Amino acid sequence: NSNICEVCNKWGRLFCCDTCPRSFHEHCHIPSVEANKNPWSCIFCRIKTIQERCPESQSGHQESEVLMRQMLPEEQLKCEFLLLKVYCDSKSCFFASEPYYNREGSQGPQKPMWLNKVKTSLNEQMYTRVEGFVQDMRLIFHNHKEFYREDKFTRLGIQVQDIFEKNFRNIFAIQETS
Numbered sequence: 001n002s003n004i005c006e007v008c009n010k011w012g013r014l015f016c017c018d019t020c021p022r023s024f025h026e027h028c029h030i031p032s033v034e035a036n037k038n039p040w041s042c043i044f045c046r047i048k049t050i051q052e053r054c055p056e057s058q059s060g061h062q063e064s065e066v067l068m069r070q071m072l073p074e075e076q077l078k079c080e081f082l083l084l085k086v087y088c089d090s091k092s093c094f095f096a097s098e099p100y101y102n103r104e105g106s107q108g109p110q111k112p113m114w115l116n117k118v119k120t121s122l123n124e125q126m127y128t129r130v131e132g133f134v135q136d137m138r139l140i141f142h143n144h145k146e147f148y149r150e151d152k153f154t155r156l157g158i159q160v161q162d163i164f165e166k167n168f169r170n171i172f173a174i175q176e177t178s
């Protein structure tokens with residue numbers, strides 16, 4: 001197994017996957033690394049199994065159809081994995097915890113949103129469709145762009161949104177377009 005957390009790239013108290021060489025901090029994995037379960041398989045491995053059990057699940061899909069899917073166990077998992085892929089980027093730090101807004105010439109968003117809030121919402125099964133999760137994720141970046149206006153820091157929102165969107169298209173096998 002790797003000697004650093006796959007998500008945050010630090011050492012520490014790591015739980016090792018049995019079916020791949022990745023390792024995780026307990027609360028870096030999503031869902032949080034399960035208490036017992038020998039062998040244990042990480043979310044990467046669980047996602048690869050879904051694909052292997054249903055090869056056709058990789059054929060292209062329309063985003064509108066994906067969004068309307070109910071959050072059954074496989075879609076729950078896919079959203080957990082997509083959230084984890086965002087946390088994998090170090091620039092996720094800016095969007096992880098609860099923000100506050102006091103900048104001359106700007107007003108804060110009407111509906112603040114942050115990664116840890118989305119993480120709790122997933123854990124608490126608060127989303128009934130994929131659309132709920134995706135809307136909250138895109139709101140994070142939209143709030144950031146609106147608030148920061150012409151400050152160059154707006155780019156951090158563009159950057160992490162691009163990570164989100166590329167991973168969304170991959171995980172949910174969105175049909176490729178120009």
Ligand SMILES: [Zn+2]
Nearest residue numbers: 005008025028
């Ligand atoms: Zn970690």
Ligand SMILES: [Zn+2]
Nearest residue numbers: 017020042045
């Ligand atoms: Zn694994």
Ligand SMILES: [Zn+2]
Nearest residue numbers: 053054055056
């Ligand atoms: Zn099949």
